[PDB]
Amino acid sequence: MKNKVQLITYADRLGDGTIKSMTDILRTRFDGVYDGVHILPFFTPFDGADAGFDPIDHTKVDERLGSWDDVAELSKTHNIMVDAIVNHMSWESKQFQDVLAKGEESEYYPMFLTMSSVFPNGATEEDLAGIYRPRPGLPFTHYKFAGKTRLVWVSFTPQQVDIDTDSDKGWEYLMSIFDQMAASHVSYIRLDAVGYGAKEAGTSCFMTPKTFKLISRLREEGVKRGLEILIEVHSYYKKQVEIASKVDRVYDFALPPLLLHALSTGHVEPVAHWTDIRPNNAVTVLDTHDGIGVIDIGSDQLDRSLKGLVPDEDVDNLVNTIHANTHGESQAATGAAASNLDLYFVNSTYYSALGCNDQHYIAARAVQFFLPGVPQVYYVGALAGKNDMELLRKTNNGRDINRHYYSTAEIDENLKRPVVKALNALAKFRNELDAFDGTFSYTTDDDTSISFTWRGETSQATLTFEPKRGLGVDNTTPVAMLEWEDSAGDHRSDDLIANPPVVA
Ligand SMILES: OC[C@H]1O[C@@H](O)[C@H](O)[C@@H](O)[C@@H]1O
């Protein structure tokens, strides 16, 4: 996967509301900045319950957004990452409606998982109890096949029915999706809910062998079409390092909350630790289109005894430091869990989570870009955006606080801000200097300082990071220093907003 910075955006929430308008904004206002892009699901429909992840037809672009040819057009300039939902589909898909009508008789009946599919001899209490759940209850709901009442496997909502991926119709279906992906020249595929995709009795049905088997099968099928695979997994971090070894790429989900901590406190050990132990076949992010996941660095969900990269109190003080820095907006948006070790995500923008502090933000981005992996930026953070309370109050959907519909006017108006210009400058720097295609080294003091070093062929760079040097939401003291070597020799930057870095 190309080592240039990628952008993450909705088609309709950046520009006029379309794939072409998106491509326009991307080409005209971001050239050299984002050389690649991740387009969040654009299939039929895009405006549903879960904002694209519950398509009715995965194979077809929403005709309000565009077509496949808009995708193919965009492939010529930019590398493109797209979503493939491999675990489930709409109960309003023709395939499932057909099973509903004809029951066993045909033809899609085997495509779909039931309790009998996995558990032909019954299930124990322990059988069902041990299953990993992103959502509450049992992963089963009631539906009627022809006339007979059936329990159908459901991982997330009763509306998204789980496919048996080892079956022929199920595989035939996933391959209809890849074939269309390759036809429009997608580079990179995000495999969604793939952790949950393989069910075997007596297991947690989450990241078991049968699942790796499925992933490697999908990998080989992808490389055959020139598609690299990427898995999205929120879990206990040791499982993450476990998983990460046996696949091509993964998200780095630890770093954003880690940076929130360090900018909050000034303790950098945890980060020197993560730098030492993190998997480097990664995609790095700060913000995504879901909330800030705190479960990643916390204690394990099933067994509270396995402790993260900080104490449970420091996770509590993180959820509450966000709540405080945004003066209660995340409270409005994050539904209360009665405790903070029970939270998955804290819904807020990563600018707001910093109390709209520019020095802290830009430092965070710097560190993200210095660590090994391919960096991604989300449109809202590319625009350094604040929490949107109107939509949140419009839709009552927590995650909409971090998804703002940006018209072109708003983009060009937010483009004027110095922090936005510093971020742009910094991506361009990350893209143009060849030192990053090189080798990575790091140094730490104890707590006060960490230095990240890259050395390439014609060029060198080092970023030193000291959150102790200034503290607090309104503190304007630069916490990151930069030095580098290129055609023009040894250069330096002690403030990354006012004195942004350029290459020769
Ligand atoms: O499909 C259910 C969930 O799947 C995940 O892969 C997506 O990132 C979520 O945003 C979505 O709600």
Coordinates of C-alpha atoms and ligand atoms in Angstrom, one line a residue:
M1 CA 0.0 0.0 0.0
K2 CA 1.4 3.4 -1.1
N3 CA 3.1 5.4 1.7
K4 CA 1.3 8.7 0.8
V5 CA -1.4 10.3 3.2
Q6 CA -4.9 9.2 2.5
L7 CA -8.2 11.1 3.2
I8 CA -11.3 9.6 4.7
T9 CA -14.6 11.2 3.7
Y10 CA -18.2 10.7 2.9
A11 CA -19.1 11.5 -0.7
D12 CA -22.1 13.7 0.3
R13 CA -20.6 15.4 3.3
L14 CA -17.7 17.1 1.3
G15 CA -18.6 19.4 -1.5
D16 CA -22.0 19.7 -3.4
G17 CA -23.2 16.2 -2.3
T18 CA -21.7 13.8 -5.0
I19 CA -18.8 11.5 -5.9
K20 CA -17.8 13.9 -8.7
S21 CA -18.1 16.9 -6.3
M22 CA -15.9 15.1 -3.9
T23 CA -13.4 14.3 -6.6
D24 CA -13.5 18.1 -7.5
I25 CA -12.7 19.3 -4.0
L26 CA -10.0 16.6 -3.6
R27 CA -8.2 17.6 -6.8
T28 CA -8.6 21.4 -6.6
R29 CA -8.1 22.2 -2.9
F30 CA -5.9 19.2 -1.7
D31 CA -3.4 18.3 -4.5
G32 CA -0.1 16.8 -3.2
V33 CA -1.7 16.7 0.3
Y34 CA -3.9 13.6 0.1
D35 CA -2.6 11.4 -2.8
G36 CA -5.1 8.6 -1.9
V37 CA -8.6 8.4 -0.4
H38 CA -11.0 6.2 1.5
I39 CA -14.6 6.6 0.4
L40 CA -17.2 5.5 3.0
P41 CA -20.0 3.2 1.7
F42 CA -21.7 4.8 -1.4
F43 CA -24.0 1.8 -2.2
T44 CA -27.8 1.4 -2.2
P45 CA -28.8 3.2 0.1
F46 CA -26.3 5.5 1.8
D47 CA -28.8 7.4 4.1
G48 CA -30.0 4.4 6.1
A49 CA -29.8 3.5 9.8
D50 CA -26.0 3.0 10.1
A51 CA -25.0 5.6 7.3
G52 CA -24.0 3.3 4.6
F53 CA -23.0 0.0 6.4
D54 CA -26.4 -1.4 6.0
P55 CA -26.7 -1.4 2.3
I56 CA -29.7 -3.1 0.6
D57 CA -27.7 -3.7 -2.6
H58 CA -23.9 -3.7 -2.1
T59 CA -23.2 -4.0 -5.8
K60 CA -24.8 -0.7 -6.9
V61 CA -23.8 2.9 -6.4
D62 CA -26.6 5.0 -4.9
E63 CA -27.8 6.9 -8.0
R64 CA -28.1 10.1 -5.9
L65 CA -24.3 9.9 -5.4
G66 CA -23.1 8.7 -8.7
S67 CA -22.0 5.6 -10.5
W68 CA -19.1 3.2 -10.8
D69 CA -17.6 5.3 -13.6
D70 CA -17.1 8.2 -11.1
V71 CA -15.1 5.7 -9.1
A72 CA -13.1 4.7 -12.1
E73 CA -12.6 8.3 -13.2
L74 CA -11.1 9.0 -9.7
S75 CA -8.8 6.0 -9.9
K76 CA -6.6 7.8 -12.6
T77 CA -5.2 10.4 -10.1
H78 CA -5.9 8.9 -6.7
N79 CA -5.4 5.5 -5.0
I80 CA -8.8 4.4 -3.7
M81 CA -9.9 2.5 -0.6
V82 CA -13.4 1.1 -0.5
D83 CA -15.5 -0.9 1.9
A84 CA -16.5 -4.6 1.5
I85 CA -19.1 -5.8 4.0
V86 CA -18.3 -9.5 4.2
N87 CA -20.2 -10.7 7.3
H88 CA -23.8 -9.8 6.7
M89 CA -26.5 -8.1 4.5
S90 CA -30.0 -6.5 4.4
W91 CA -32.9 -8.7 5.4
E92 CA -34.5 -6.6 2.5
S93 CA -31.9 -8.0 -0.1
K94 CA -33.6 -10.1 -2.8
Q95 CA -31.6 -13.2 -1.6
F96 CA -33.0 -13.1 1.9
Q97 CA -36.6 -12.2 0.8
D98 CA -36.3 -15.2 -1.5
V99 CA -35.4 -17.5 1.4
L100 CA -38.2 -16.0 3.4
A101 CA -40.7 -16.8 0.6
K102 CA -39.5 -20.3 -0.6
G103 CA -37.9 -21.4 2.7
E104 CA -35.8 -24.4 2.1
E105 CA -36.9 -24.9 -1.5
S106 CA -34.4 -22.3 -2.9
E107 CA -31.9 -21.1 -3.9
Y108 CA -30.2 -18.7 -1.5
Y109 CA -31.3 -20.7 1.5
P110 CA -27.7 -22.0 2.3
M111 CA -26.3 -18.4 2.0
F112 CA -27.7 -17.6 5.4
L113 CA -26.7 -18.6 8.9
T114 CA -29.1 -19.9 11.6
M115 CA -28.6 -21.4 15.1
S116 CA -29.0 -24.9 13.5
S117 CA -26.4 -24.1 10.8
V118 CA -23.7 -23.8 13.5
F119 CA -25.2 -26.0 16.3
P120 CA -26.9 -29.1 14.8
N121 CA -26.7 -31.0 18.1
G122 CA -28.0 -28.4 20.6
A123 CA -26.0 -25.7 22.1
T124 CA -25.1 -25.6 25.8
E125 CA -25.4 -22.5 27.9
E126 CA -21.6 -22.2 27.6
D127 CA -21.8 -22.6 23.8
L128 CA -23.9 -19.4 23.5
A129 CA -22.5 -17.5 26.5
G130 CA -18.9 -17.5 25.3
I131 CA -19.8 -15.7 22.0
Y132 CA -18.1 -12.2 21.5
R133 CA -20.8 -9.5 21.3
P134 CA -20.5 -5.9 19.9
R135 CA -24.2 -5.7 20.8
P136 CA -26.3 -7.0 23.7
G137 CA -28.3 -10.2 24.0
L138 CA -28.0 -13.3 21.8
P139 CA -26.9 -13.1 18.2
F140 CA -30.3 -14.5 17.1
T141 CA -33.7 -13.2 15.9
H142 CA -37.0 -14.5 14.7
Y143 CA -37.9 -14.7 11.0
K144 CA -40.1 -17.0 9.1
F145 CA -38.9 -19.3 6.3
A146 CA -41.9 -20.0 4.1
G147 CA -44.1 -20.7 7.1
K148 CA -41.7 -22.1 9.7
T149 CA -40.3 -19.9 12.4
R150 CA -36.5 -19.7 12.5
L151 CA -33.7 -18.2 14.6
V152 CA -31.3 -16.3 12.2
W153 CA -27.8 -15.5 13.3
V154 CA -27.4 -11.8 13.8
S155 CA -24.2 -10.2 14.8
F156 CA -25.3 -6.6 15.1
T157 CA -28.9 -5.6 14.3
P158 CA -31.8 -7.9 13.6
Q159 CA -31.9 -6.1 10.2
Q160 CA -28.4 -7.3 9.1
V161 CA -28.4 -11.1 8.6
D162 CA -25.2 -13.0 8.7
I163 CA -24.0 -15.0 5.7
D164 CA -22.3 -18.4 5.8
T165 CA -19.1 -17.5 4.2
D166 CA -17.9 -21.1 3.5
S167 CA -21.1 -21.6 1.3
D168 CA -21.2 -21.2 -2.5
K169 CA -23.9 -18.6 -2.8
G170 CA -22.2 -16.6 0.0
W171 CA -18.9 -16.8 -1.6
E172 CA -20.5 -16.2 -5.1
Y173 CA -21.9 -13.0 -3.5
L174 CA -18.7 -11.7 -2.0
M175 CA -17.0 -12.3 -5.3
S176 CA -19.7 -10.3 -7.2
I177 CA -18.5 -7.5 -4.8
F178 CA -14.8 -7.9 -5.5
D179 CA -15.3 -8.2 -9.3
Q180 CA -17.1 -4.9 -9.3
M181 CA -14.4 -3.4 -7.0
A182 CA -11.6 -4.4 -9.4
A183 CA -13.5 -3.4 -12.5
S184 CA -13.6 0.3 -11.2
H185 CA -9.8 0.1 -10.2
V186 CA -10.0 0.1 -6.5
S187 CA -6.6 -0.3 -4.9
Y188 CA -7.4 -1.2 -1.2
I189 CA -10.3 -3.1 0.5
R190 CA -11.5 -2.7 4.0
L191 CA -13.0 -6.0 5.1
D192 CA -15.9 -5.1 7.5
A193 CA -17.0 -7.2 10.4
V194 CA -14.6 -9.8 9.1
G195 CA -13.6 -10.7 12.8
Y196 CA -17.2 -12.1 13.2
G197 CA -17.3 -13.8 9.8
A198 CA -16.6 -17.4 10.8
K199 CA -18.7 -19.4 13.2
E200 CA -17.6 -22.7 14.8
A201 CA -19.3 -24.4 17.8
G202 CA -17.5 -24.0 21.2
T203 CA -15.6 -21.0 20.1
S204 CA -16.1 -17.3 20.8
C205 CA -16.8 -17.1 17.0
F206 CA -14.4 -14.1 16.9
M207 CA -10.9 -14.2 15.4
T208 CA -10.6 -18.0 15.5
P209 CA -8.7 -20.2 13.1
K210 CA -11.7 -20.6 10.6
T211 CA -11.6 -16.7 10.4
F212 CA -7.9 -16.5 9.5
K213 CA -8.6 -19.2 7.0
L214 CA -11.3 -16.9 5.5
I215 CA -9.1 -13.9 5.5
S216 CA -6.2 -15.7 3.8
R217 CA -8.7 -17.1 1.3
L218 CA -10.0 -13.5 0.7
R219 CA -6.4 -12.3 0.5
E220 CA -5.3 -14.6 -2.3
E221 CA -8.6 -13.8 -4.1
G222 CA -7.8 -10.1 -3.8
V223 CA -4.2 -10.2 -5.0
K224 CA -5.6 -12.1 -8.0
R225 CA -7.5 -8.8 -8.8
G226 CA -4.9 -6.4 -7.5
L227 CA -6.6 -5.5 -4.2
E228 CA -4.8 -5.3 -0.8
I229 CA -6.8 -6.3 2.3
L230 CA -7.3 -4.4 5.5
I231 CA -9.1 -5.6 8.6
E232 CA -11.0 -3.4 11.1
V233 CA -10.8 -4.8 14.6
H234 CA -11.5 -3.0 17.9
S235 CA -10.2 -5.1 20.7
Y236 CA -7.8 -5.8 23.5
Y237 CA -4.4 -4.6 22.3
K238 CA -2.5 -7.9 22.8
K239 CA -5.1 -9.6 20.6
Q240 CA -4.5 -6.8 18.1
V241 CA -0.7 -7.5 18.0
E242 CA -1.7 -11.2 17.8
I243 CA -4.0 -10.6 14.8
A244 CA -1.7 -8.2 13.2
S245 CA 1.0 -10.8 12.6
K246 CA -1.2 -13.1 10.6
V247 CA -2.7 -10.5 8.2
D248 CA -1.4 -8.0 5.7
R249 CA -2.6 -4.7 7.4
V250 CA -4.5 -3.4 10.5
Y251 CA -5.6 -0.1 12.1
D252 CA -3.5 1.5 14.8
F253 CA -6.4 2.2 17.3
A254 CA -4.3 2.7 20.4
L255 CA -2.5 5.9 19.3
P256 CA -5.4 8.4 19.3
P257 CA -6.3 7.8 23.0
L258 CA -2.7 7.5 23.9
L259 CA -2.1 11.0 22.5
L260 CA -5.1 12.3 24.3
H261 CA -3.5 11.0 27.6
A262 CA 0.0 12.4 26.9
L263 CA -1.3 15.8 25.9
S264 CA -3.6 15.7 29.0
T265 CA -0.7 14.6 31.4
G266 CA 2.8 14.8 29.9
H267 CA 3.6 11.2 30.7
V268 CA 5.2 9.7 27.5
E269 CA 6.4 6.2 28.7
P270 CA 3.1 4.5 27.5
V271 CA 3.9 5.8 24.0
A272 CA 7.6 4.7 24.1
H273 CA 6.2 1.3 25.1
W274 CA 3.7 1.3 22.2
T275 CA 6.4 2.5 19.8
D276 CA 8.5 -0.5 20.9
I277 CA 5.6 -3.0 20.8
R278 CA 3.2 -1.7 18.0
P279 CA 2.7 -3.6 14.7
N280 CA 4.1 -1.5 11.9
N281 CA 2.0 -2.9 9.1
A282 CA -0.6 -0.4 10.0
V283 CA -2.9 2.3 9.0
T284 CA -2.6 5.3 11.4
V285 CA -5.5 7.5 12.3
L286 CA -6.5 10.1 14.9
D287 CA -10.2 10.6 14.1
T288 CA -12.4 8.2 12.1
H289 CA -16.1 8.3 11.3
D290 CA -17.1 6.3 14.5
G291 CA -16.2 7.7 17.9
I292 CA -12.9 7.6 19.8
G293 CA -12.5 4.0 20.9
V294 CA -11.3 3.7 24.5
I295 CA -11.8 -0.1 24.6
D296 CA -8.6 -0.4 22.6
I297 CA -6.2 0.7 25.4
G298 CA -8.4 -0.5 28.3
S299 CA -8.9 -3.7 30.2
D300 CA -10.3 -6.6 28.3
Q301 CA -14.1 -6.8 27.9
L302 CA -14.6 -10.4 29.2
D303 CA -11.8 -10.6 31.7
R304 CA -11.2 -7.4 33.7
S305 CA -7.8 -8.7 34.9
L306 CA -5.9 -8.0 31.8
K307 CA -4.7 -4.4 32.1
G308 CA -4.0 -2.1 29.2
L309 CA -1.2 0.4 28.5
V310 CA -2.5 2.5 31.4
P311 CA -4.5 1.8 34.7
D312 CA -8.3 1.8 34.8
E313 CA -8.2 5.1 36.6
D314 CA -6.3 6.7 33.7
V315 CA -8.9 5.5 31.3
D316 CA -11.6 6.9 33.5
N317 CA -9.6 10.2 33.7
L318 CA -9.4 10.1 29.8
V319 CA -13.2 9.7 29.2
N320 CA -13.7 12.5 31.8
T321 CA -10.9 14.8 30.5
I322 CA -12.7 14.6 27.1
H323 CA -16.0 15.3 28.7
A324 CA -14.4 18.3 30.5
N325 CA -12.4 19.8 27.5
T326 CA -15.6 19.9 25.4
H327 CA -17.7 21.3 28.3
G328 CA -20.3 18.5 28.2
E329 CA -20.9 18.0 24.5
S330 CA -19.6 14.4 24.5
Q331 CA -22.0 13.8 27.4
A332 CA -24.9 14.8 25.2
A333 CA -23.5 12.6 22.4
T334 CA -22.1 9.6 24.3
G335 CA -24.8 7.5 25.8
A336 CA -24.0 6.9 29.5
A337 CA -22.7 3.4 30.4
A338 CA -22.9 3.7 34.3
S339 CA -19.1 3.3 34.3
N340 CA -16.3 4.3 31.9
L341 CA -14.5 0.9 31.6
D342 CA -17.8 -0.3 30.0
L343 CA -17.6 2.3 27.2
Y344 CA -16.7 1.5 23.7
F345 CA -16.5 4.9 22.1
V346 CA -16.6 8.5 23.3
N347 CA -18.5 10.4 20.6
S348 CA -16.7 13.8 19.9
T349 CA -14.3 15.4 17.2
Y350 CA -10.6 15.1 17.8
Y351 CA -10.3 18.9 17.6
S352 CA -13.0 19.4 20.3
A353 CA -11.4 16.6 22.4
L354 CA -8.3 18.8 22.7
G355 CA -10.4 21.9 23.6
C356 CA -9.9 23.3 20.2
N357 CA -6.2 23.7 21.0
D358 CA -4.0 24.1 17.9
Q359 CA -0.5 23.2 19.2
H360 CA -1.6 20.0 20.8
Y361 CA -3.6 18.9 17.7
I362 CA -0.7 19.6 15.2
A363 CA 1.8 17.8 17.5
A364 CA -0.6 14.8 17.6
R365 CA -0.7 14.7 13.8
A366 CA 3.1 15.0 13.7
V367 CA 3.5 12.0 15.9
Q368 CA 1.0 10.0 13.9
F369 CA 2.9 10.7 10.7
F370 CA 6.3 9.9 12.2
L371 CA 5.3 6.4 13.3
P372 CA 5.4 3.4 10.9
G373 CA 2.3 2.8 8.9
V374 CA 0.3 4.6 6.2
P375 CA -1.4 7.7 7.6
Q376 CA -5.1 8.6 7.1
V377 CA -7.0 11.9 7.8
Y378 CA -10.8 12.2 8.3
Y379 CA -12.5 15.1 6.6
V380 CA -13.7 16.7 9.8
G381 CA -10.1 16.7 11.2
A382 CA -8.7 17.7 7.9
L383 CA -11.0 20.8 8.4
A384 CA -10.2 20.9 12.1
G385 CA -13.9 20.8 12.8
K386 CA -15.9 21.3 16.0
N387 CA -18.7 19.3 17.4
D388 CA -21.9 19.8 15.5
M389 CA -24.7 20.0 18.0
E390 CA -27.4 20.9 15.4
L391 CA -27.3 17.6 13.4
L392 CA -26.9 15.7 16.7
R393 CA -30.1 17.4 17.9
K394 CA -31.6 16.8 14.4
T395 CA -30.8 13.0 14.1
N396 CA -30.4 12.0 17.8
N397 CA -27.6 9.9 16.4
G398 CA -24.6 10.2 18.6
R399 CA -22.0 9.6 15.9
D400 CA -23.5 12.5 13.8
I401 CA -21.7 14.9 16.2
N402 CA -18.5 14.0 14.4
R403 CA -20.1 13.9 10.8
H404 CA -20.7 17.4 9.5
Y405 CA -22.1 18.0 6.0
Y406 CA -19.5 20.5 4.6
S407 CA -20.6 22.6 1.6
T408 CA -17.7 24.0 -0.6
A409 CA -18.2 27.4 0.9
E410 CA -17.5 26.0 4.4
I411 CA -14.5 24.2 3.0
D412 CA -12.9 27.2 1.5
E413 CA -13.9 29.3 4.6
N414 CA -12.3 26.7 7.0
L415 CA -9.3 26.5 4.6
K416 CA -8.3 30.1 5.7
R417 CA -7.4 29.0 9.3
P418 CA -3.7 28.7 10.1
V419 CA -4.0 25.2 11.8
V420 CA -5.6 23.9 8.6
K421 CA -2.7 25.3 6.6
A422 CA -0.2 23.8 9.0
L423 CA -1.8 20.3 8.6
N424 CA -1.8 20.6 4.8
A425 CA 1.8 21.7 4.9
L426 CA 2.7 18.8 7.1
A427 CA 1.0 16.1 5.0
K428 CA 2.8 17.6 1.9
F429 CA 6.0 17.4 3.9
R430 CA 5.3 13.7 4.8
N431 CA 4.6 13.0 1.1
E432 CA 7.5 14.9 -0.7
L433 CA 10.4 14.0 1.6
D434 CA 11.7 10.5 0.8
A435 CA 13.2 10.0 4.2
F436 CA 10.0 8.1 5.1
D437 CA 10.5 5.3 2.6
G438 CA 13.7 4.6 4.7
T439 CA 14.4 3.3 8.2
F440 CA 12.8 4.3 11.6
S441 CA 14.6 4.8 14.9
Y442 CA 13.4 6.3 18.3
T443 CA 14.8 7.6 21.5
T444 CA 13.2 8.3 24.9
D445 CA 14.3 10.0 28.0
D446 CA 11.9 8.7 30.7
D447 CA 8.8 10.8 30.8
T448 CA 9.6 14.5 29.7
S449 CA 10.8 13.7 26.1
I450 CA 10.6 11.4 23.1
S451 CA 12.3 11.7 19.7
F452 CA 11.2 10.0 16.5
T453 CA 13.8 9.6 13.8
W454 CA 13.6 8.7 10.1
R455 CA 16.6 8.3 7.9
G456 CA 16.4 7.8 4.1
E457 CA 18.7 8.1 1.0
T458 CA 19.0 11.8 0.2
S459 CA 17.3 13.0 3.4
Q460 CA 16.8 12.8 7.2
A461 CA 14.2 13.9 9.8
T462 CA 13.6 14.0 13.6
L463 CA 10.6 15.0 15.6
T464 CA 11.0 15.7 19.3
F465 CA 8.0 15.6 21.5
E466 CA 7.6 17.2 25.0
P467 CA 4.0 17.6 26.3
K468 CA 5.4 18.8 29.7
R469 CA 6.6 22.1 28.1
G470 CA 3.0 23.4 28.2
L471 CA -0.1 22.1 29.7
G472 CA -3.8 22.9 29.6
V473 CA -6.5 23.4 27.0
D474 CA -5.6 27.1 26.4
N475 CA -1.8 26.7 26.4
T476 CA -0.1 28.1 23.3
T477 CA 3.5 26.7 24.0
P478 CA 4.7 24.4 21.2
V479 CA 5.1 20.8 22.4
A480 CA 6.8 19.5 19.2
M481 CA 10.2 20.4 17.6
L482 CA 11.3 19.4 14.1
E483 CA 14.6 19.1 12.4
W484 CA 15.6 17.7 9.0
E485 CA 18.2 17.3 6.3
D486 CA 17.6 17.6 2.5
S487 CA 19.1 19.0 -0.8
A488 CA 19.4 22.4 1.0
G489 CA 21.1 20.9 4.2
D490 CA 20.1 21.0 7.9
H491 CA 16.9 22.9 8.7
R492 CA 14.7 23.3 11.8
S493 CA 11.2 24.2 13.0
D494 CA 10.3 25.0 16.7
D495 CA 6.7 26.0 15.9
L496 CA 4.7 23.9 13.4
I497 CA 1.7 26.2 13.0
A498 CA 3.3 29.6 12.5
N499 CA 6.5 28.3 10.8
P500 CA 5.3 25.2 8.9
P501 CA 7.9 22.9 7.2
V502 CA 8.7 22.9 3.4
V503 CA 11.0 20.6 1.3
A504 CA 13.7 21.4 -1.4
Ligands
LIG1 O1 -21.6 -2.7 10.1 C1 -21.7 -2.4 11.6 C2 -20.5 -1.6 11.9 O2 -19.4 -2.2 11.2 C3 -18.1 -1.5 11.3 O3 -17.3 -2.1 10.4 C4 -18.2 0.0 10.9 O4 -17.0 0.7 11.1 C5 -19.2 0.7 11.8 O5 -19.2 2.1 11.5 C6 -20.6 0.0 11.6 O6 -21.6 0.5 12.4

